[PDB]
């Protein structure tokens, strides 16, 4: 199907990009129910800038039109044991995000689920867990609680809730 993200304002069709990566925060606390939760990054521009996969377009949560991985999805972090350091996820296959111009951007549900499954598999091996849950943003200012990006001198804010709501065993 199709996951449609509401954006304000309406991005023109030429602002369609490829998702080349994303940046996540590992949820703290215990639980210890053999599951590890992840949300889009609760950090700021320092977290984004130090992933070194961005490209020319300034964006949050998702990397648009950036560097792609060589073969497999590759995850990195300055310190896996510090839930205050973000986890840079570099994709090997980009996921196109098509802006219609009506006030929403659409991505293929199938392509996104397959990307998440590969991200979960790489996350599962790094934290030695069994279940990986993606949850929406914990909150924050509009540029960071939304997937926000720069295109043609205008700034756009898109709700990313529908992109981070799955469980993977």
């Amino acid at each position, epitope marked *: 199907d199709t996951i449609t993200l509401p954006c304000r304002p309406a991005p023109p069709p030429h602002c369609s990009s490829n998702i080349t990566g994303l940046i996540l925060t590992r*949820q*703290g*606390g215990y639980s210890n129910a053999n599951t590890v939760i992840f949300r889009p990054s609760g950090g700021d521009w320092r977290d984004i800038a130090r992933c070194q996969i961005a490209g020319t377009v300034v964006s949050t949560q998702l990397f648009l039109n950036g560097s792609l991985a060589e073969e497999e999805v590759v995850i990195r972090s300055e310190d896996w044991r510090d*839930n*205050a350091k973000s986890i840079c996820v570099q994709l090997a296959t980009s996921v196109e995000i098509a802006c219609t111009g009506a006030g929403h951007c659409a991505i293929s549900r199938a392509k996104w689920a397959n990307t998440l499954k590969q991200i979960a598999s790489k996350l599962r091996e790094q934290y030695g867990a069994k279940t990986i849950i993606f949850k929406p943003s*914990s*909150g924050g200012d509009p540029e960071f609680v939304n997937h926000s990006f720069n295109c043609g001198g205008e700034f756009f804010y898109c709700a990313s809730t529908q992109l981070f709501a799955s469980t993977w065993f």
Partner: antibody
Amino acid sequence: QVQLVQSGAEVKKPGASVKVSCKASGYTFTGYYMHWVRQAPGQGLEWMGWINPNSGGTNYAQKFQGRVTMTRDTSISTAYMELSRLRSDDTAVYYCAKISGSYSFDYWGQGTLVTVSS
Amino acid sequence: DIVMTQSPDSLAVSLGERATINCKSSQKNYLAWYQQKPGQPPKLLIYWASTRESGVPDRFSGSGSGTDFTLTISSLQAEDVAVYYCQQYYSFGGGTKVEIKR
């Protein structure tokens, strides 16, 4: 000199909501993450979560997801912790604490006693 | 997010004698030690496992690596009676209460 000054003691009925504040001074407020730690009377230290003052992003311990909300106002250098749906075992001293570059808490608020009772 | 275990939970030391507190994680070294007195927030004593905060008397020292860590008060003074916590990342130890043995 770095100072973290918190709001006064509160008494609240079970199921209400408390909003603790913490005003920072003497350092660049948006430059360090602010953490919240609580301590039940005679008990240990329990980490609740952090907030990034630059973006307002937060990361709560799973125990408090849904009940806790951390915010900040950069124009007055004040961080806020709000705990909702209070129970008696939420009675504790609530501390804001500023992380350092050594991943230790070198400056703490003076603490905010929150008593939950009918 | 790990679990820090502090032993012992309570420690009675004669005046002038050596006190040792142990802290191990269930998994450089970012261990910090704190001193808490009644009615007061914890006060940072040691960070990076062994670096002493400014104004902290020499009789306080920490050591250890990996998963075992130690706080040592070489000559216990009356003012050192308090609860001591270790901290690694955002997990605290349960605390060790240090008192005068008589």
